[PDB]
Design a protein around this ligand. Structure first.
Ligand SMILES: [Ca+2]
Length: 222
């Protein structure tokens, strides 16, 4: 995350760090929602580790749990549909992040968080960083990215003049905001962008509302 500040311990307890250099959210205590592009595909897999419970990855309170299976979005092949679920062998005992099932919250000021680079080309981070980025219309995003944008499956955010954005290593993490009931709700998954925090180059996120029933469907059978 570029242009952010340190998240406090316990502030976003649903955040998890994945071992291949991605973030994720606890959709269930033993099910991590991340980006399809952070993994190879669906199958029983135990080579991934999720670290939960801490903002400081070096903390003795970190809980590291191994994956048992990976379910990449059905139909994913690199163009849109950027979501995946990772079933954990043990649950991480922290609150889960509700996902948006309607488009009602695809607007406003979002919150992003991750252990990715805090400057384009930079190193990953020890401490979780958070930032706020504004919703950007698909049209504004299309002027920035042209045919690369899959409008009904991607939601954009960031400032036209740059400065605040997710960056390498933040992929897979949740983009969220409050709902009417004062609960965080997930509207996006960090997916891609051109550079980080550049002028005119917004961050692109998986539009969770488009995939919510499919993610829930996958989760019940995972
Ligand atoms: Ca969209």
């Amino acid at each position: 995350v570029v242009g952010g500040t340190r998240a406090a311990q316990g502030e976003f307890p649903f955040m998890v760090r994945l071992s291949m250099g991605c973030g994720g959210a606890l959709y269930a205590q033993d099910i991590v929602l991340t980006a399809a592009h952070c993994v190879s595909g669906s199958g029983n897999n135990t080579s991934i580790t999720a670290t939960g419970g801490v903002v400081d990855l070096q903390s003795s309170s970190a809980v590291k749990v191994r994956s048992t299976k990976v379910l990449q979005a059905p139909g994913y092949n690199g163009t849109g549909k950027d979501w995946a679920l990772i079933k954990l062998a043990q649950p991480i005992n922290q609150p889960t992040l509700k996902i948006a099932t309607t488009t009602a919250y695809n607007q406003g000021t979002f919150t992003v968080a991750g252990w990715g680079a805090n400057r384009e080309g930079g190193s990953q981070q020890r401490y979780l960083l958070k930032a706020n980025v504004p919703f950007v219309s698909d049209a504004a995003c299309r002027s920035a990215y042209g045919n690369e944008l899959v409008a009904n499956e991607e939601i954009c955010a960031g400032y036209d003049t740059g400065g605040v954005d997710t960056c390498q290593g933040d992929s897979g993490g949740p983009m969220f905001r409050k709902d009417n009931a004062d609960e965080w709700i997930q509207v996006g998954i960090v997916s891609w962008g051109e550079g980080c925090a550049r002028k005119g180059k917004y961050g692109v996120y998986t539009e969770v509302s488009t995939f919510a029933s499919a993610i829930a469907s996958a989760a019940r059978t995972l």
